[model samples]
Target: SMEMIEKAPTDLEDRDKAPHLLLLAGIQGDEPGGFNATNLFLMHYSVLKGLVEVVPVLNKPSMLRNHRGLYGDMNRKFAALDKKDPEYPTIQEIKSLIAKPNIDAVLHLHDGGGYYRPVYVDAMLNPKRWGNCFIIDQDEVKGAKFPNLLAFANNTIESINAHLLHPIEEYHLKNTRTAQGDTEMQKALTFYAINQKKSAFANEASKELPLASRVFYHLQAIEGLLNQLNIPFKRDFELNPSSVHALINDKSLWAKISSLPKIPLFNLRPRLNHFPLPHNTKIPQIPIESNAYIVGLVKNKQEVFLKYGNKLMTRLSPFYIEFDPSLEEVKMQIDNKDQMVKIGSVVEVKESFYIHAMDNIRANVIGFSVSNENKPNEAGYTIRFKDFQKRFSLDKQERIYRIEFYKNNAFSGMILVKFV
Candidate 1:
């Protein structure tokens, strides 16, 4: 349903000796502050010698629609859920991770309301507000597996406050005491972890702050948690307000499949829209190579759709299509002459050119007709833009056409061609 990405060292490395922490965000899909933060962490941070498991988006259907939950709030259904419910499979898996023997701690992140306070302040800044706090089931659990809760929370607060963006914006410790009869949070994910005798904390960033600010605060907590667990790591970026401001829209991604020598992945420049999937499946398959896509956004007009594998992640549009960098050679019949073009060499075509289909690879133009499905070996079909421009399902000024290459019906990569 969702991918649990793990970061560690070599396979022979002694992982069991290191602390294993599970980081979860976007359990409530409407609150995506932590999701972005966790995604960035997965991108840049490296565990020198430890285990850091990230579930950046736990509720897929909800995230796809930006709803709090597909059935209902997922965190509330963790306790005794019917197996038939859509959320049960994910909850069951999360429960197993929490109960994992090597797991040192679980941090369930959220974007909550107002500021957290120990004493009565303004209604919005009072004790009831869960934002900007490290929430625990009780002040302490007697002789529990990870019982030193107060010290951990205090230390975490101290570390976070050291890099506070401002004075009023601060973090605190909130003890909901669910185990002592706090009925509202009885079946919540954290409480379920507590019931299993596992130490779990809810890290909340204020919903009142900007989304980037919320992520900045969440990342501070992540570093603090890592420090507490004695997990050595290299933070590629510093914990500062400016860094968050500059990197909020830095969610760039590059992806590819079946890459080999002279056939590089489609290295598209990172942007928020028009990302393309090489294959035609509604969901893109995940490859173990260096790809930033196990989870990403699929832009559709003004709507936001989140895709994970067997779900939605890698995909695209034709207007702003990109292509594979180093092809062995591009063979096409241009100006009535058969020529093989090398990389970075521009060839001027009078009107349109014919792409010759070669061994193990076939060519396709997005709006132009090329009999790729039929797999004609000796024939390379011709595509004239003006004749096919009206056939293109795009806006005005449709000049460039997308040429895709496939090997044995599998999506190989893409390239862009322009007509004069």
Candidate 2:
């Protein structure tokens, strides 16, 4: 489920002069680290006053439940959908909010699974292209003439990164996984078209960072952007960049070209359309995967008992169980279930999942779990289960899950679940 809460400055009119910076975090249900940072930033009035609106928890229930929300990956479902769909409400609400004319930028924060750097930023200008850094060049803003806004963003990145207490990484690619050119450029472009008057950017925080440290880094990066843009604040570093330039020289080209008549003068045929001569350089594709944690599950009727000295009690029903890595091999441990003596042999669980090599790549686990009895003598057992739902969240720490195939050693995977 999604929750929509709005916060604006006491003097509403001040919001008009300021570039509307929409700060969103925890779009993914399990990424509490993102939400934690967002919460910390909301406490400061200096950062809140510079933006027109702030929707800190777009996927509220998801983050609170410690599981992916009802509408899985609500961030990607930005396009219009049938009203009957479960996610339609949140989707429509977000689209409407983002479409507001005053929204100058969007900061969608997130967390990574591995022990990585403190901060990462993504300026989602061209959805189908990749670049070195997210520079706000007019050429990058699809078809528009707002070069000043782009220049402001370009300067903000440098200013913020330089003053931050910790270093942050910047990525300019649309598709992080697969290293292929296939990406939904139309999605970002469509979003821009619907909200053509504004600019937007995405920000992410590493999950491995402590909660306090993550919040500090997030606020610092945001303050950096505000300071560089010359946004008034009670206390923030004042460092605006004067040397940056916009990608487009003629600001009126877009509007001027659109206003001209479709038929050219003197019945002259349009010049042959070809790739621009000077912009023929190729961009490298970077393989980055979503940094959320995930796990595999199985279904069986075998008698099972709660491990860890009878903390709880339950039968071996179909559910997710935790595994311990410290054992000699992969071992299953049940929690909150009573101890029971079992007669059936404990079979190994399967270890198979997918990963994309791009940063912030949205992933979902879709498969069927079958019991080991149905298919006899197979290398591994399968659990028969219906539509088992799971949410995506980055692992705060490295979690080891025991797999039948990887019994000899411990394997690493992201943890998509959260505990309330």
Candidate 3:
């Protein structure tokens, strides 16, 4: 969970001159589409005219646990709260932001059970449903900056419906009429925002869709609202279901443990054994580029896991080692040509490869056994594809292997060998 305040480049000259909008997600941690959609906005879109405040994951603990509420349903605690309650501080913080004079409107993202319809057509598409709709607390708010809630919601719904991946995925407007005392919605975040005289709306995607598809609908709805508010923005990818799906499943995400080189997350095996890591730490510093990712330890304490939302990316089994910065690079022969490869680079090999011996640095090519008086130093060997044990590869395809460098007895750095 994180908070970001993104303002257009021109608005930086005068912060107070631009309109303000609050965009929130993950109020209910089980609804991953909300956070993923909002996170995409933060990661790729550039605001061109106004400011957007985003809280991508409001209930992080519940998201990590995949629970509706780690303490209790966080969204329900917005209208009123107990001082002793865990959600008190969070609710108060959001209220303070909404209470600010510059805020014109607010949007809360959600994933509900099924398609919402004003009339009861079927079990999954009915009045009782909550998904694929724009939820407004009232038809109008007397003092709000954007007073006509119904009009804005209808326009946004029209915009969203234009790009529906399927006809079944069409969006609608569902006015909860909280001002007339609708019990459940009166306790929700949008109701609280309306009470503060800020135009607030909730966009719900169907839970039946896959995560990426759900994210696509949410982004569509978000763009719709942004357009209605007269805020111009640019997103890197084209607005289509396939593009949105690809963006959500992007493989370029990287992370670093302690202060090591960036480890690419794309081609990692399910479990990596004898993984090089820093010594003397219970949990090493794992810095990732995206808020959607989290690092944690397996129960045995021997392995560290990397995750994207609730999906496990990889598990790293440690081989704790000391550090040495003395060695910077290694001289290697790829196929028939000689090259000086920097640490943390991948070398492509077609036929065979060899690493030249250094004065004090030793090279250990994992997956290729060494039979010499100097057992750990595998520098002198000319290795081929058949020489490697596939089980020792870093990736599932068994073509990538690690070449670790050590100075004296301390670990220095590593390079990768990808047999092309």
Candidate 3, residues 1-420, lDDT tens digits: the string is: 345556454557544445678998888778988888887887788887778888777776666556678789888887667999977888788888877788889999999998898999999999899889899999998799789989989999999989888998888889998878788788889998998899999999999889888889899888889888877779889987788788777776665555345555667889988787766655423333433333233323567666555556688888788867667678898997889988867778899999998988888888988674544889988999999989899878898888888887688988888888
Q: Kindly give the number of clashing pairs for every candidate.
A: 5, 30, 0
Q: TM-score for model 2?
A: 0.44
Among residues 3 or more apart in sequence or in different chains, the pairs in candidate 1 whose N, CA or C atoms overlap within 3 Å are: 275-316, 276-315, 276-316, 277-315, 307-312
Question: Against the true structure, what is each candidate's TM-score?
Answer: 0.71, 0.44, 0.82
Root-mean-square deviation of every model: 7.4, 23.3, 3.8
Show the lowest summed lDDT stretch of 10 residues, model 3: 291-300
Best candidate, TM-score-wise? 3
How many clashes in candidate 2? 30
Which pairs of residues clash in candidate 3, taking residues 3 or more apart in a chain or in different chains? Answer: none
Q: What order do candidates take by TM-score, descending?
A: 3, 1, 2
Q: Residue by residue across 154-176, what tens digits does model 2's lDDT show?
A: 56556545544343334332222
TM-score of 3: 0.82
Candidate 3: list runs displaced more than 4 Å.
5-7, 14-18, 80-93, 276-285, 290-303, 319-363, 372-375, 379-387, 405-420
Q: Rate the local accuracy (lDDT) of all candidates.
A: 0.66, 0.37, 0.79
Best candidate per lDDT, number? 3
